[PDB]
Amino acid sequence: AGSRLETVGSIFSRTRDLIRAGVLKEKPLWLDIYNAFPPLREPVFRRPRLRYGKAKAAVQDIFYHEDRIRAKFYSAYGSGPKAFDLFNPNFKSTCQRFVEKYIELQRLGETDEEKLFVEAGKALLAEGVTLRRVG
């Protein structure tokens, strides 16, 4: 008949060696195509064991220095008056304007926080955005 054991190995293994003994006398289609283009990993059964002890994930949380600025933008003024759209691919809000004003003020050689912040804030008061200034 065949091998219905889901655990034992990848379908490639089961099939290939099944044929190999002469039990299955008809090669399936998918076996030949699979010989042509093997996928990244062999689909072998693995047991979803939970982690114990000091073992933690390998994920790297995602952060940039831009965010270290956006943190202070939000800290002062709040979310931008332009609202947001995740529909528009290239969209950039008030916060992005603030980030790039602060970047171009950073290459200017000002190491101080208040200078960069307030002068990128006037740099924004020039372009026509309204910074509410929440307490």
Binding site: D61, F63, Y64, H65, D67
Partner: protein, 97 residues
């Protein structure tokens, strides 16, 4: 040499830890008013954490304080002192519905 990668930075968006109503205050057993607020009006009972909503430290200090104000004779055991019934209301208990 890809400069768009992530930074191994600490969380900038990290919020401030919330604080008990007494967080970095100080409690003495010599103010019976303060201790009154955390006590039940009709009973003279001491509200649990789920009502007062204080950290462990501040709750324990509140309690030790209530006891110490009671046996020395600063505060009555069996009721809230009438004077303080009309004070500000901290707790989440609604008795009357």
């Amino acid at each position: 040499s890809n400069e768009d990668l992530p930074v191994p930075m600490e969380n900038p968006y990290k919020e401030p830890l919330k604080k008990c109503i007494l967080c970095e205050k100080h409690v003495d057993y010599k103010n019976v008013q303060l201790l009154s607020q955390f006590i039940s009006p009709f009973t003279g009972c001491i509200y649990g954490r789920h009502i007062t909503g204080l950290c462990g430290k501040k709750q324990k200090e509140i309690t030790k304080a209530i006891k110490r104000a009671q046996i020395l004779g600063f505060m009555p055991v069996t009721y809230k002192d009438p004077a303080y019934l009309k004070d500000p209301k901290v707790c989440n208990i609604k008795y009357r519905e």
